[PDB]
């Protein structure tokens, strides 16, 4: 195997050599440690076959690291190599020089990076430019030795759009892991010459050109106008990168239009249908979409108005999309579609996920409580979905009843009634605790609000501690309000609570709530039952120094994930 | 009619998890439309071909009605296929196994010696709370029958009986009477068996049951003798399981009497020394031997024996050997505990062992070993084991030692230092449940509360994420703020409590995002302490609390405008209800 | 920006894997299917993995998880741009996408990676310009990617100039169970296989709205697409000045332009059911369809699915026109109809029983879809005007086009 | 009592189950689907004994097929592995050379036999001359 | 394969 | 013939607009 694969590859015959490397290439993808042979592939390099050469090459690659002992064997192939005519074996051998993870081989390769950064080829510019970016990656200071800092600006100023493109990308990569010290910033006429050569660069030089873009900060109104006007192409690219690129490009310039001008109108009015054109592409940049349209949203939430039928999640979209639909409804919540809201919300409940049911429920009580027109409309789907007679939408519905009566609690006493009985038997701490404080804050429009909590006092030393202290709370509450049913009731419940209830925090509560029972029962109803201020909701909204930062950062990996550009990596 | 066989080929040939599903919907489809048609003929293809789908995971609640329906049909095949139904997808939970009764009633009582047993072994098997009602009846009257194939399965069905219904033994008590002279080795299996079930259930039967002692003795010294036999005998060790159903019976008989244990000391000791361990089953009736004279008032000799074996097998490179070792030590804590303690090495050994089994088995060991003098000692070990313990064993590590620290802490000063050692080096592993019973441990302690105050002050101000240490650090601060900072009401000098750094500190850990609204209520209810315990920092708290009234939660607004209501209305009355709470055990 | 794109197996084998960066250590492809696993069993399961500081993020192939491993905050975007081009010039040079061809053309797969992207740059994409560079069965790089034009290969020759354009249409109608339809949008396809000599650049004319508006002809029927989306040989300058669809088409088959818009007419076919299940007695499927559609066209291998219940057994179908057939595998009753004239109206009574023992858990509603086509036909009303077809040699084109119309997303929510 | 019984391989494929504690169908697929994990991520040092929910889940695997056992905290851990190698013994007898191939078309046979053996997680047949000859018996019956 | 391996190999 | 509706020739730009 080993040996006479060694044997082979020490051979003078090519047709045996082919099958040799042919049969290594394979044993490597096999998952099969092929390093151990890296020398014996040595010698067999230089070989006129431009198959075997890439062969070679990959191996050497992927063998680089693992011995970097005998990678220094190869130095000489790659310079003979770097003045082949041949401009694919060129290109080759420049892609080969900077994958090779080797500090002493780096050094060596400067002068036919060099050599090849005036190359002829666009190919070859293209590849010297990857090259150059890689050493760099690998050695700044190597790369800031050599100077090609000055070759790769002058790159951008040349022809072939497509070498163009790829020297702005890997001059702004080195300026992305440089500390903003010297940076490549380009004056106006940059800017006009990059726009030029924006109508003829390929589909992956287009990002690359606006990638470019968002790095400059306008100072004119004039200077924005041509941005824009050129950026507008953009948005009729079958690219969806390029399409999210020139969107987020536009809403990055938007920062220092003025909305007095018509330009805001227009470029308003020509994002919507870019918008409409994103939602309804694959799956997998379906979830980018949302993601972008989510982080644009809190900054101009005008232009998306009117776009409310395309939030709908499909019956076969994905759990991730389904997720995200929720999101940007919530987000584009309005008035004027809230029946198609609370129409997509009741058909949203009948599915089958659980996380999904909880999802749209959450979000069904976000809707109700942004807005008080649809109060109503928001406490009959949560009566509905109760009635349903779904032990997590009932447990749902709990948690958005509990919440709603903090909210809006001055008409809700037509609904204390219903869910007087609606199937307590629920043990579900986040709905148990809801309904109990319903039940302390509510304890008028029911006349068995004493026998009701009879059932939930057999177990309150045990309960939980949140839902002990919620019961403890309803009781006082009940006590101030109705003490003459209610007399023996507080007492045992002090009783439980400050002598078989051993929480440090609860047992506080109790002991509190007997010195002020003892000390002055009228006083009681003032400050235990008193009238709460409005409660201030979390706001969803992010902080508009984020929004800003998050603007620039458009099509990353910060989007998704909602987290700083700097909070994330490593 | 596809044959069980094609199916398992055709599901093996399926690649994707979606095509297997897809092949095993259209084959349910075809077996769902072959039993609406009241099929009879090719129905164990069908019924084998239901359970290979159910075992594979899909659904059959639709297959059940075909299984009753073979049930009580004739045909042997059919009789099988409707028992295996039963056994595994019927269940008392199903409810479907409520018809059934007749079928077992109707095929209890048949002559053929197959469907009997296999009636018995379903009813075993499936053995519901109201099945055993109306059958009990039928399971008594085989008991007393002279079949050998047929005894171990009545005494089977005796004993599922009586585990699923306890107050039904009362009518075995004379059926297993004078059968301790049955030749065939699973009647009497079955019998001891039954006899230890019953011991076990209930104390009555001890005395009625302790009689058969000597006949046991005899029986186990003639197996003893008879070490040859074709049947049974499974790397030299004949009879393994009648063995050690002796020696469990043995342990479980006389663990209170003398005269019972003495009876049966002889046989130990003849065991102990005549039994080879080379093989596992050697050394399972040596170690359930050592049981049962551990468990049992057994003489010195016999414990010396058994703290010898113990010692011996401890020491063994096997890992099921050193598991049961551990078990056996783990066991025998309580008792021998003197004995115990020459195996502290090994015990410390064992901790950091590449069992996972092994190094739990060593932890158990330890804490269970943890003496009133080795405490102080052990305490060292123990914290470096939590430190450079499993993430799933450095929450059980941490619990062990505080309930150790709780039990026998030599002090209070030293248990409250390891207390707040484990506190700050558990971080998200100590148990919220532990939280009432340190603060429970807090407030009986009056005499060591600057130190712990001071404590808590520096390990609160470095870290705010633990749940468990913040929640203590707040009890600590809102119960002695009155010995935390001495002379703080006006501006001092430079020392570590200044009496705004605390507030500070609240308000940041109330508004700080990492809140479970659990320490956040406590860090309110201290807050609200700090009024009349602390009187320096004084009209600064009533605007937070007025702006935290209108907090998210239902409960924190709650106290927050209960709190802004004291404050504003209620100032002259705050110390009359700021009382310290009581403390008791 | 990712920092390995890699090619998975359905059992967690790497089919082929090739690093751009280096900056991520191989054995991390190892962690992945049992984050996988873990997010799919607690219902977390995203595109994009994480492993720490380094994010795994992966679509789902025919066969494979294409997995591309990064470790900045790299373009996710590009890197899903990277990712479909891809896997479009994997199915135009393999016929398949399974572990038959991953395993069987590697030799040509190693230098496509590695020529595709260098260093996390995508620099080729174009499978008609990689095959003329990339071959499994080689010369200098061809020009035409150095040139301008690198959708238009030059110096193409052929005997005859015919294109064969595709008018598709796409019917997406989202009727809720109330009766009333949410989301109903016609998504146009300009798709045109052109097989001609030389680099012919297509003039593209037909009968827009804004077009008509700005011409002064805006009274006729012109179609209004809001959103319309050129192919990559299309100039978005021309487009942007006067609407001048002027560009270069490509050698073979691509999409041009790609109409977007809402839908305000009648749907094509009206489709009525009724569920007269009894209570785990039987079941009744009043499925009444009505061809919406006008009466000169004809729906063409027409398929309403209809679900069926998930334990149902023992089905009788009475219909009165097209077979019907149920599909265990699907767990639905597919109305098919070979030919559906416009203006029929087909009624159906399906009934079947039900097993006594009730269902453990629920199954869901899943909506009703069909699978109309029915070419020939345009209900936009959009019409080609004309196609500027030019060479610089000179040559009488004769371009086609047929106009297809078919469902889309086309589903009915249930009662 | 064994609690359960299952034979499942090594890549997770259970090729047996019989389980003698009545739960949910969700609840036995949640624990079966906990053991594999478990069982699949363990070591060949581990000494084939996890104590899973106060449970003696014992492990010990011949071939790439595992078996798996649980048993309650009041009997000792080598009984549990000699009635595995005895039952191992047994089917191989009935069988001859049992292989996994075998052990997937011979489901029902092997559960007749697992039924003969055991009853109720208890012993059933102490002998193997004697459970072997009226399993031939009963097959002989038709 | 691996499946067609006697289980204990007698 | 084709389904999908038959293959028709097209023009090459509006003759009606000059």
């Known amino acids: 195997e080993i040996f006479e694969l060694k044997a082979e590859l020490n051979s003078d015959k090519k047709e045996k050599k082919k099958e040799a490397v042919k049969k290594v290439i394979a044993s490597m993808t096999v998952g099969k440690d092929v390093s151990a042979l890296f020398p014996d592939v040595v010698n067999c390099m230089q070989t006129d076959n431009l198959e075997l050469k890439k062969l070679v090459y990959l191996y050497l690659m992927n063998y680089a690291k693992s011995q970097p002992d005998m990678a220094i064997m190869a130095v ?18 420049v892609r080969t020089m900077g994958c090779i993870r080797v500090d002493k081989i780096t050094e060596y390769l400067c002068e036919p990076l060099r050599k090849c950064l005036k190359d002829e080829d666009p190919y070859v510019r293209k590849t010297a430019a990857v090259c150059v970016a890689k050493l760099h990656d690998i050695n700044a200071q190597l790369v800031e030795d050599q100077g090609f800092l000055d070759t790769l600006k002058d790159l951008i100023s040349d022809s072939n759009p497509m070498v163009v493109a790829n020297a702005v990308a890997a001059l702004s990569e080195i300026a992305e892991s440089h500390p903003s010290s010297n940076l490549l910033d380009l004056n106006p006429q940059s800017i006009n010459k990059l726009l030029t050569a924006l109508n003829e660069c390929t589909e992956w030089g287009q990002i690359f050109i606006l990638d470019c873009l968002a790095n400059y900060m306008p100072k004119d109104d004039r200077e924005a106008q041509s941005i824009c006007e050129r950026v507008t192409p953009r948005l009729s690219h079958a690219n969806s990168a390029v399409v999210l690129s020139a969107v987020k490009v536009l809403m990055k310039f938007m920062e220092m239009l003025s909305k007095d001008l018509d330009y805001y109108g227009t470029l308003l009015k020509k994002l919507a249908p870019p918008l409409v054109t994103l939602l309804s592409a694959e799956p997998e940049l379906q979830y980018v979409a949302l993601r972008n349209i989510n982080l644009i949203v809190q900054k101009r939430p005008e232009i998306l108005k009117h776009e409310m039928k395309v939030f709908f999640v499909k019956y076969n979209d994905p759990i991730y999309v389904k997720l995200e639909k929720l999101d940007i409804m919530i987000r584009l919540a309005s008035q004027a579609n809230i029946a198609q809201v609370l129409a997509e919300l009741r058909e949203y409940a009948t599915e089958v996920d659980v996380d999904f049911v909880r999802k749209a429920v959450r979000a069904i009580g976000r809707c109700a409580i942004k807005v008080e027109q649809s109060a109503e409309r928001c406490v009959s789907t949560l009566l509905d979905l109760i009635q349903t007679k779904v032990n997590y939408v009932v447990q749902e519905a709990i948690v958005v009843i509990k919440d709603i009566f903090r909210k809006y609690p001055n008409k809700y006493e037509s609904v204390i009634a219903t869910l007087c009985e609606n199937l307590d038997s629920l043990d579900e701490p986040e709905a148990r605790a809801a309904m109990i ?58 009783s439980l609570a400050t002598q078989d209830s051993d929480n440090p925090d609860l047992r506080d509560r109790g002991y509190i709530y007997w010195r002020l029972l003892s000390t002055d029962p009228v006083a009681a109803k003032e400050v235990v039952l008193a009238e709460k201020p409005l409660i201030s909701e979390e706001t969803d909204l992010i902080e508009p120094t984020l929004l800003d930062e998050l603007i620039c950062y458009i099509g990353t990996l910060a989007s998704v994930y909602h987290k700083p550009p700097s909070a994330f990596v490593e | 009619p596809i044959r069980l066989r094609e199916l398992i080929r055709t599901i093996r040939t399926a690649r994707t998890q979606a095509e297997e599903r897809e092949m095993i919907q259209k084959e349910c489809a075809a077996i769902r439309s072959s039993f609406r048609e009241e099929d009879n003929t090719y129905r164990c293809r069908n019924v084998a071909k239901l359970l290979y789908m159910h075992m594979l995971g899909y659904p059959a609640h639709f297959g059940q009605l075909e299984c009753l329906k073979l049930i009580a049909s004739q045909k042997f095949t059919d009789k099988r296929i409707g028992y295996l139904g039963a056994m595994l997808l019927l269940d008392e939970r199903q409810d479907v196994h409520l018809l059934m009764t007749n079928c077992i009633k109707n095929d209890l009582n048949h002559s053929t010696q197959f469907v009997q047993g296999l009636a018995l072994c379903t009813l075993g098997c499936m053995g519901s709370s109201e099945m055993c009602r109306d059958l009990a009846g039928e399971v008594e009257k085989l008991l007393k029958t002279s079949n050998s194939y047929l005894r171990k399965k009545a005494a089977l069905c005796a004993v599922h009986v009586i585990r699923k219904v306890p107050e039904l033994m009362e009518m075995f008590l004379p059926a297993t009477k004078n059968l301790l002279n049955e030749k065939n080795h699973g009647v009497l299996h079955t019998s001891v068996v039954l006899l230890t079930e019953m011991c076990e259930r209930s104390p009555d039967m001890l005395a009625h049951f302790r009689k058969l002692v000597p006949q046991l003795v005899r029986i186990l010294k003639n197996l003893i003798m008879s070490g040859y036999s074709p049947e049974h005998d499974v790397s030299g060790i004949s009879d393994p399981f009648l063995q050690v159903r002796i020696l469990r019976l043995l342990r479980i008989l006389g663990r209170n009497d003398d005269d019972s244990s003495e009876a049966m000391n002889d046989i130990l000791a003849q065991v102990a020394t005549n039994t080879e361990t080379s093989k596992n089953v050697g050394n399972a009736i040596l170690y359930e031997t050592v049981l049962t004279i551990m468990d049992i008032k057994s003489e010195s000799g016999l414990r010396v024996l058994a703290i010898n074996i113990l010692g011996r097998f401890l020491l063994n490179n096997d890992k099921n050997i050193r598991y049961v070792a551990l078990t056996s030590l783990l066991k025998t ?16 050994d064992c901790l950091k062992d590449l069992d996972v089994s092994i190094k739990r088995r060593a932890m158990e060991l330890s804490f269970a070993l943890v003496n009133g003098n080795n405490i102080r000692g052990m305490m060292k070990e123990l914290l470096y084991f939590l430190d450079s313990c499993e993430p799933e064993f450095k929450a059980d590590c941490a619990s062990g030692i505080f309930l150790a620290a709780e039990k026998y802490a030599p002090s209070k000063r030293w248990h409250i230092d390891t207390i707040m050692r484990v506190l700050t080096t558990a971080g998200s592993y100590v148990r919220d449940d532990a939280v009432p019973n340190l603060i429970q441990l807090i407030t009986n302690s009056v005499e060591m509360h600057a130190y712990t105050v001071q404590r808590l002050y520096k390990a609160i101000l470095g870290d705010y994420s633990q749940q468990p240490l913040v929640q203590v650090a707040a009890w600590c601060i809102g119960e002695y703020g009155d010995l935390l900072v001495s002379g703080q009401c006006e501006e001092e000098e430079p020392i570590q409590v200044t009496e705004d750094e605390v507030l500070d500190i609240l308000e940041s850990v109330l508004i700080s995002n990492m809140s479970t609204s659990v320490t956040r209520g406590y860090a309110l209810t201290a807050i609200m302490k700090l009024s009349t315990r602390f009187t320096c920092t004084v009209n600064r708290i009533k605007k937070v609390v007025s702006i935290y009234g209108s907090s998210i939660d239902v409960e924190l607004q709650q106290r927050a405008v209960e709190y802004n209501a004291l404050f504003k209305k209620y100032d002259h009355m705050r110390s009359a209800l700021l009382e310290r709470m009581p403390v008791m055990e | 920006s990712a920092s390995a794109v890699y090619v998975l197996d359905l059992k967690g084998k790497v089919l082929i894997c090739r690093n751009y960066r280096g900056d991520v250590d191989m054995s991390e492809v190892e962690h992945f299917m ?121 110096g193409i020759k052929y005997r005859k100039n015919e ?144 679900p069926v219940p998930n334990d149902a057994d023992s089905p009788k179908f009475k219909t009165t026109v097209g077979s019907v057939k149920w599909v265990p595998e699907n767990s ?84 | 009592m064994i609690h359960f019984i299952l034979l499942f391989s090594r890549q997770g494929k259970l090729r047996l189950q019989k389980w003698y504690i009545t739960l949910p169908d969700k609840e036995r697929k949640k624990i079966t689907r906990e053991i594999v994990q478990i069982i699949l991520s363990r070591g060949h040092r581990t000494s084939s004994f996890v104590d899973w929910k106060e449970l003696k889940l014992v492990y010990k695997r011949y071939a790439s097929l595992y078996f798996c056992c649980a048993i309650e905290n009041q009997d000792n851990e080598l009984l549990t592995l000699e009635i595995v190698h005895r039952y191992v013994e047994l089917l191989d007898k009935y069988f001859g ?28 047949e102490t002998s193997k001359k004697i459970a072997v000859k009226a399993i031939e018996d009963s097959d002989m019956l038709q | 394969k691996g499946e067609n391996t006697s289980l204990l190999h007698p | 013939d084709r389904k999908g509706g038959s293959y028709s020739q097209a023009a090459g730009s509006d003759s009606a607009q000059s």
């Open chain 2, 333 to 348: 804590v309580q008792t021998d505990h003197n004995a115990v303690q020459r195996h502290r090495s090994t015990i410390v």
């Open chain 4, 97 to 124: 050379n049992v292989c996994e191939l075998d052990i997937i078309f011979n489901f029902e046979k092997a559960y007749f036999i697992l039924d003969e053996f055991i009853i109720g997680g208890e012993i059933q």
């Open chain 3, 34 to 154: 049992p984050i996988l696993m873990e997010k799919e069993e607690e219902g977390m399961l995203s595109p994009i993995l994480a492993h720490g500081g380094v994010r795994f993020m992966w679509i789902k192939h025919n066969n494979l998880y294409l997995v591309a491993t990064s470790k900045k905050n790299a373009c996710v975007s590009l890197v899903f741009s990277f990712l479909y081009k891809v896997v479009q010039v994997f199915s135009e040079y393999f016929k398949e996408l399974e572990e038959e061809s991953i395993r069987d053309n590697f030799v040509i797969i190693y230098e496509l990676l590695d020529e595709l992207m260098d260093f996390g740059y995508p620099q080729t994409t174009d499978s008609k310009i990689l095959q003329e560079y990339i071959t499994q069965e080689a010369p200098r790089p061809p020009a035409t990617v150095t040139n301008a034009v690198s959708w238009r290969s030059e």
């Open chain 1, 437 to 494: 404080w319903i039940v302390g804050e509510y304890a008028e429009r029911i006349d068995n609000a004493d026998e009701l909590l009879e059932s939930f006092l057999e177990g309150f030393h045990d309960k939980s501690t949140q839902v002990q202290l919620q019961l403890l709370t309803a009781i006082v509450k009940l006590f101030l309000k109705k003490p003459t049913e209610t007399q023996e009731l507080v007492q045992q419940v002090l």
């Open chain 3, 332 to 415: 639905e009753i597919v109305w098919s109809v070979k030919s559906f004239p416009g203006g029929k109206e087909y009624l159906m009574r399906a009934h079947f029983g039900l097993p006594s023992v009730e269902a453990e858990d629920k199954e869901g509603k899943p909506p009703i879809s069909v699978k109309f086509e029915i070419p020939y036909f345009t209900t936009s009303g959009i019409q080609v005007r004309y196609l500027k077809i030019i060479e610089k040699s000179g040559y009488q084109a004769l371009p086609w086009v047929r106009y297809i119309t078919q469902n889309g997303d086309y589903q009915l929510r249930t009662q």
């Open chain 3, 163 to 306: 294109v064969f354009l595709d008018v598709i249409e796409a019917v997406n109608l989202l009727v809720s169970a109330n009766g009333n339809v949410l989301r109903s949008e016609i998504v146009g396809s300009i798709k045109m296989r052109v097989f001609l000599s030389g680099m012919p650049e297509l003039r593209l004319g037909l009968n827009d709205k804004v077009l008509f508006d700005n011409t002064g002809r805006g009274k006729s029927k012109s179609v209004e697409l809001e959103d319309v989306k050129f192919h990559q040989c299309v100039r978005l300058s021309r487009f942007e000045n006067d609407r001048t669809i002027s560009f270069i088409p490509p050698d073979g088959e691509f999409e041009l332009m790609s109409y977007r818009l809402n839908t305000h007419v009648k749907p094509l076919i009206w489709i009525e059911s009724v569920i007269e299940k009894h209570s785990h007695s039987r079941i009744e499927y009043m499925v009444k369809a009505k061809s919406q559609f006008k009466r000169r066209s004809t729906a063409n291998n027409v398929e309403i699915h209809i």
């Open chain 1, 76 to 93: 000489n192939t790659f310079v003979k190599d770097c003045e082949d005519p041949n401009p694919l074996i060129r290109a080759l051998a």
